[PDB]
């Protein structure tokens, strides 16, 4: 996991893969040539290949091939199904080794790649009222999610743009940790009225 790099072009992806990667290393990133699309950048035989990911708003594919509801599902499929990424001469492209992007925070309440359902299971099993965690958004690559247990589990999208974080267009913060601290001191409340107290973190293991 951690293969998604939010803030990079293909030129930077090539730099990262040729410096920190090995043959078989790969990452995903946003598209510059078609804003809204994504791209895989893959190191193969000492060079970097870029693969366009179409985002129709209803699915992701590689302009053809299998379709996926989320980017993570597309990436997982092509990691697990050998031979399904091929060029016209027959050359296969293999997604072997995720080239990891640094986490936006070091705090243990950040769970990185964690699906919403996995986070709900975690919070119902191991959490208490007011327990919370932060994870990556699967439906909005590059955004994050505050998942809070109150029994129910509430998910709050955290928009990340230009290295700034906000909730619903509210106050913007310079880091994930600043946003979390603020909303611990100033609990947000749902429209239905539920107060999302951030009483204690549910920490990764």
């Amino acid at each position: 996991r951690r293969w998604f790099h939010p803030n990079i072009t293909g030129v930077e992806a090539e730099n990262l893969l040729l410096t920190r990667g090995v043959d078989g290393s790969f990452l995903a990133r946003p598209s510059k040539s078609n804003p809204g699309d994504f791209t895989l950048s893959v190191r193969r035989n000492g060079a970097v290949t870029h693969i366009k990911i179409q985002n129709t708003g209803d699915y992701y594919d590689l302009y053809g091939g299998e379709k996926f509801a989320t980017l993570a599902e597309l990436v997982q499929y092509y990691m697990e199904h050998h031979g399904q990424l091929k060029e016209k001469n027959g050359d296969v492209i293999e997604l072997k080794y995720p080239l990891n992007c640094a986490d936006p925070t070091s705090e243990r309440w950040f769970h990185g790649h964690l699906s919403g359902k996995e986070a709900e299971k975690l919070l119902t099993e191991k959490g208490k009222h007011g327990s919370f965690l932060v994870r990556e958004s699967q439906s909005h690559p590059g955004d994050f999610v505050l998942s809070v247990r109150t029994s129910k589990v509430t998910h709050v999208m955290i928009r990340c743009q230009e290295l700034k974080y906000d909730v619903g267009g509210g106050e913007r913060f310079d880091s994930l940790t600043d946003l979390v601290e603020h909303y611990k001191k100033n609990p947000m409340v749902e429209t239905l009225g539920t107060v999302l107290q951030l009483k204690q973190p549910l920490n990764t293991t």
Binding site: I51, G64, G65, A69, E73, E87, A119, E120, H155
Partner: protein, 31 residues
């Protein structure tokens, strides 16, 4: 600048559905 692979999607078989997993709902926050 950045150049992109031309993939061959012919050969074998692919599904036509949207591979999806169970998802969660994102709440609305009062301003």
């Amino acid at each position: 600048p950045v150049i992109y692979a031309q993939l061959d999607h012919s050969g074998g078989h692919h599904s036509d559905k949207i591979n999806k997993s169970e998802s969660v709902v994102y709440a609305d926050i009062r301003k």
